[PDB]
UniProtKB/Swiss-Prot annotation, chain A:
Subunit structure: Component of the 19S proteasome regulatory particle complex. The 26S proteasome consists of a 20S core particle (CP) and two 19S regulatory subunits (RP). The regulatory particle is made of a lid composed of 9 subunits, a base containing 6 ATPases and few additional components including PSMD2. Interacts with RPGRIP1L. Interacts with CRY1 in a KDM8-dependent manner.
N6-acetyllysine, modified sites: 235
Physiological role: Component of the 26S proteasome, a multiprotein complex involved in the ATP-dependent degradation of ubiquitinated proteins. This complex plays a key role in the maintenance of protein homeostasis by removing misfolded or damaged proteins, which could impair cellular functions, and by removing proteins whose functions are no longer required. Therefore, the proteasome participates in numerous cellular processes, including cell cycle progression, apoptosis, or DNA damage repair. Binds to the intracellular domain of tumor necrosis factor type 1 receptor. The binding domain of TRAP1 and TRAP2 resides outside the death domain of TNFR1.
Tissue expression notes: Found in skeletal muscle, liver, heart, brain, kidney, pancreas, lung and placenta.
Family, as annotated: Belongs to the proteasome subunit S2 family.
Top-level lineage group: Eukaryota
Repeat region (PC), residues: 93-126, 127-163, 164-198, 201-235, 244-273
Protein name stated in the entry: 26S proteasome non-ATPase regulatory subunit 2
From Swiss-Prot, chain B:
Phosphoserine sites (modified residues): 84
Tissue specificity field: Isoform 4 is the most abundantly expressed isoform. It is ubiquitously expressed throughout most tissues, except the liver, colon, breast and uterine myometrium. Isoform 1 is expressed in the ovary and testis. Isoform 4 is expressed in several types of tumor cell lines, and at consistently high levels in leukemia and lymphoma cell lines. Isoform 1 is expressed in the prostate, breast and leukemia cell lines. Isoform 3 is the least abundant isoform in tumor cell lines (at protein level).
Induction description: Up-regulated during differentiation of bladder epithelial cells and down-regulated during differentiation of prostate epithelium.
Modifications after synthesis and translation: Ubiquitinated; mediated by SIAH1 or SIAH2 and leading to its subsequent proteasomal degradation.
GO CC annotation terms, alphabetical: cytoplasm; cytosol; membrane; nucleoplasm; nucleus
Single GO biological process annotation from the record: apoptotic process
Assembly: Homodimer. Forms a heteromeric complex with HSP70/HSC70. Binds to the ATPase domain of HSP/HSC70 chaperones. Isoform 1, isoform 3 and isoform 4 but not isoform 2 interact with HSPA8/HSC70. Interacts with NR3C1. Interacts with the N-terminal region of MAPRE2. Interacts with PPP1R15A. Interacts with BCL2 in an ATP-dependent manner. Isoform 2 does not interact with BCL2. Interacts with SIAH1. Interacts with HSPA8 (via NBD). Interacts with HSPA1A (via NBD) and HSPA1B (via NBD). Interacts with SIAH2.
Lineage: Eukaryota, Metazoa, Chordata, Craniata, Vertebrata
Region (Interaction with HSPA8): 33-80
Gene Ontology molecular function: any one: adenyl-nucleotide exchange factor activity
Range covered out of full length: 140 to 224 of 345
Protein's gene: BAG1
Main function: Co-chaperone for HSP70 and HSC70 chaperone proteins. Acts as a nucleotide-exchange factor (NEF) promoting the release of ADP from the HSP70 and HSC70 proteins thereby triggering client/substrate protein release. Nucleotide release is mediated via its binding to the nucleotide-binding domain (NBD) of HSPA8/HSC70 where as the substrate release is mediated via its binding to the substrate-binding domain (SBD) of HSPA8/HSC70. Inhibits the pro-apoptotic function of PPP1R15A, and has anti-apoptotic activity. Markedly increases the anti-cell death function of BCL2 induced by various stimuli.
Name recorded for this polypeptide: BAG family molecular chaperone regulator 1
UniProt keyword Methyltransferase present: no
Signal peptide residue numbers: none
């Protein structure tokens, strides 16, 4: 999104078409003109002519097929029944798949997710928040409903709710580089109560928001969080998102990565050798550096 | 002495450019007045209706949105289900 002033002519249409407001309308219109609108069932994708996780995968692939469409009664009419039948951790992913179906569909998606927002299960609530984030992802909005919708959940004490809200805000403000979103999510990065993977998801959201921006405060927060976290618990299985955020923030820049790696040199080898390589390759992507 | 102001309310693919004014003795349109207009037009109760402006959450019923920064050309998002008691 290019943030400019209204002094230019037809600024409303310019910012709308930059915001991709008519993206969804045109995409649905062309899908209908191709007759490619019917919701394709994961079952007849599977060709069943001849289980909780398998059903979860079926829901996910249904969401993938019907993504950006917002036309799927399988999770709309009996969606509550499907999530209730679902087991353990998959209700969040099912709601996120519904948001995938409704992505780029701001108006319809928000209304059809408002009912699931007040769901009982924490997983369903977090999935609904992530669905909202997916819906507003990519497409820009004048009033930006995601920032207001994710108000308590942004720093909510519950790990799953906070994770859903954080991933949603990351997907929404991805490329927005919004100062307000950054100044609201980086303090959430600074939280110590959140788990290691929660901090990793915060780093991922910050990186996808400030991708290719060289956001110095984001980098400093990343490094400070890495330092404050002890190395033994750092290098287990989930700190691999902080270097990813660094690489996103310095994407396509190069050269200056020497300062970042010198700052990171204090880290122990098992994670430093991974993180510096990751951030270097992400910064030098699309260059052909033999 | 009507304090008219233009707001673009959007919900459920449906958009209205409403010229709303303060009605309950306030010098400027407020959350109470906007909620009353929304309830008259649709009927969503103030408990579960969600008005979103500039990504700022509406939680206080007495906060003046005119002071919060609504001007002409501003757009707001309405979230909820149209209830027909």
């Amino acid at each position: 999104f290019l943030e400019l002033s209204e002094d230019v002519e037809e600024y409303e249409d310019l910012t709308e078409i930059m915001s991709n407001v008519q993206l969804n309308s045109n995409f649905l219109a062309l899908a209908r003109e191709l007759d490619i609108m019917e919701p394709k069932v994961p079952d007849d994708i599977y060709k069943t002519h001849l289980s909780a996780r398998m059903n979860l995968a079926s829901s996910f692939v249904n969401g993938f097929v019907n993504a950006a469409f917002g036309q799927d009664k399988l999770l709309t009419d009996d969606g509550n029944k499907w999530l209730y039948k679902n087991k353990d951790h998959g209700m969040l992913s099912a709601a996120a798949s519904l948001g995938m179906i409704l992505l780029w569909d701001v108006d319809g998606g928000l209304t059809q997710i408002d009912k699931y927002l007040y769901s009982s299960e924490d997983y369903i609530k977090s999935g609904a928040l992530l669905a909202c984030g997916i819906v507003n992802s990519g497409v820009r909005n004048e009033c930006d409903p995601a920032l207001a919708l994710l108000s308590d959940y942004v720093l909510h004490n519950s790990n799953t709710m906070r994770l859903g809200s954080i991933f949603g805000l990351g997907l929404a403000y991805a490329g927005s580089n919004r100062e307000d979103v950054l100044t609201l999510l980086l303090p959430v990065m600074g939280d110590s109560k959140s788990s290691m993977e929660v901090a990793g998801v915060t780093a991922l959201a910050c990186g996808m928001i400030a991708v290719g921006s060289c956001n110095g405060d984001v980098t400093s927060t990343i490094l400070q969080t890495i330092m404050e976290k002890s190395e033994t618990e750092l290098k287990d299985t989930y700190a691999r998102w902080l270097p990813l955020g660094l690489g996103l923030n310095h994407l396509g820049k190069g050269e200056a990565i020497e300062a970042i790696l010198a700052a990171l040199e204090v880290v122990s080898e098992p994670f430093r050798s991974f993180a510096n390589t990751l951030v270097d390759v992400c910064a030098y992507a699309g260059s052909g550096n033999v | 002495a009507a304090a008219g102001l233009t707001v673009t309310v959007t919900h459920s693919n449906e958009k209205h450019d409403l010229h709303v004014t303060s009605q309950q003795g306030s010098s400027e349109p407020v959350v109470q007045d906007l909620a009353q207009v929304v309830e008259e037009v649709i009927g969503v109760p103030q408990s579960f209706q969600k008005l979103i402006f500039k990504g700022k959450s509406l939680k206080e019923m007495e906060t003046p949105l005119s002071a919060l920064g609504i001007q002409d050309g501003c757009r707001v998002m309405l979230i909820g289900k149209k209830n027909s008691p």
